[PDB]
Each structure stands twice: as C-alpha cells, then as structure tokens.
C-alpha cells in the first residue's frame, strides 16, 4: 500500500549493493526519465545514499 502524495513515503538506501537492474520486472514505464544520469550508466557509479 502506497502513501498519499503529500505524505510521500521515504526510505534511505545505504550500506547495500544496489542492483538497479531489478527495475525491469515492473512493466513498461510511462516514464523512466533519468535526469542528470543515464538509465544505463546508473549501475556503475557508487553513491553515498
């Protein structure tokens, strides 16, 4: 169950290997717009949080 738009639910992801390639089990996305980064280069750059 997702939260309201005003009470947008936040989780911090830290200390974990990020497999951003488990996104592509959820069906054709009306939008996957990756701003400032590429949808392909994201599974490479390490990040703090």
């Amino acid at each position: 169950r997702f939260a309201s738009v005003y009470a947008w639910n936040r989780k911090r992801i830290s200390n974990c290997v990020a497999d951003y390639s488990v996104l592509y089990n959820f069906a054709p996305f009306f939008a996957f717009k990756c701003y400032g980064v590429s949808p392909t280069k994201l599974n490479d750059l390490c990040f703090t949080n």
Binding site: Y24, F32, S38, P39, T40
Partner: protein, 49 residues
C-alpha cells in the same frame, strides 16, 4: 526561442565513445539487449537525440 531551437541537438549517450574528430550522421536507437528491440522499447531503446 521560447521552448524552441530544436534544430540544435546533441547526444546524451552512445553505443561507444567517439574517436577524436569522429563524426556520426546516423541516429539509430541503442539496443536494450535484455529485450528484443527493433521497434521502440523500454530500458535502452530510447532515442539518443
């Protein structure tokens, strides 16, 4: 121009890094790889320009 000037374009990503002074007139779609893609598709079949 107000929300215009499309005639001036560039590429955010390419199948491979360009060689020095290399020119590419084509604009074909980058292959997704995980999903057959001759028509438009998801992850990586977005238009480069």
């Amino acid at each position: 121009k107000v929300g215009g000037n499309y005639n001036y374009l560039y590429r955010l990503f390419r199948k491979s890094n360009l060689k020095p002074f290399e020119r590419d007139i084509s604009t074909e779609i980058y292959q997704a790889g995980n999903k057959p893609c001759n028509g438009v598709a998801g992850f990586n079949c977005y238009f480069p320009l």
